[PDB]
Design a binder for this molecule. Sequence first.
Ligand SMILES: OC[C@H]1O[C@@H](O[C@H]2[C@H](O)[C@@H](O)[C@H](O)O[C@@H]2CO)[C@H](O)[C@@H](O)[C@H]1O
Ligand SMILES: OC[C@H]1O[C@@H](O[C@H]2[C@H](O)[C@@H](O)[C@H](O)O[C@@H]2CO)[C@H](O)[C@@H](O)[C@H]1O
Length: 131
Amino acid sequence: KPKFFYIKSELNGKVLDIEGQNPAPGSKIITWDQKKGPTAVNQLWYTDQQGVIRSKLNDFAIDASHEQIETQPFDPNNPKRAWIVSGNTIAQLSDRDIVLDIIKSDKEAGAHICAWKQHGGPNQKFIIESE
Ligand SMILES: OC[C@H]1O[C@@H](O[C@H]2[C@H](O)[C@@H](O)[C@H](O)O[C@@H]2CO)[C@H](O)[C@@H](O)[C@H]1O
Ligand SMILES: OC[C@H]1O[C@@H](O[C@H]2[C@H](O)[C@@H](O)[C@H](O)O[C@@H]2CO)[C@H](O)[C@@H](O)[C@H]1O
């Protein structure tokens, strides 16, 4: 029922990816080279009926409880787990000044992601790309 999308970095054209296709909670979200087709499941995302981002793989939310972002089951009363599309950024629903951010602008595949104060830099710039 939902249409899925990639979250693609303007820093290097790599996409957000649940490391190793791991459906367990606490799996790191990293940058990785884009896959197409049935194996792309851990790079595909959608927004739920309230507009909040989830993974196609396990319907988990993005979680910024730790320095590095990871997957966790969605909890509507945990502000660290509600992330939204906001123009060319992924923003924290509860604080729009906080966006997803490729740590230290690392351009290598496998880079980790953090929640950071918005500054307009290319490491905070993401394009939503329909599957
Ligand atoms: O390492 C990030 C990368 O992992 C891929 O999954 C690999 C896994 O890393 C490897 O240990 C196993 O032998 O094969 C899997 C499939 O190639 C993910 O597919 C990819 O999306 C990234 O998350
Ligand atoms: O650490 C997250 C934060 O890093 C900034 O980049 C810094 C980096 O932390 C530092 O080690 C290096 O010497 O200087 C970099 C450039 O100022 C990012 O700008 C910010 O977006 C976050 O990613």
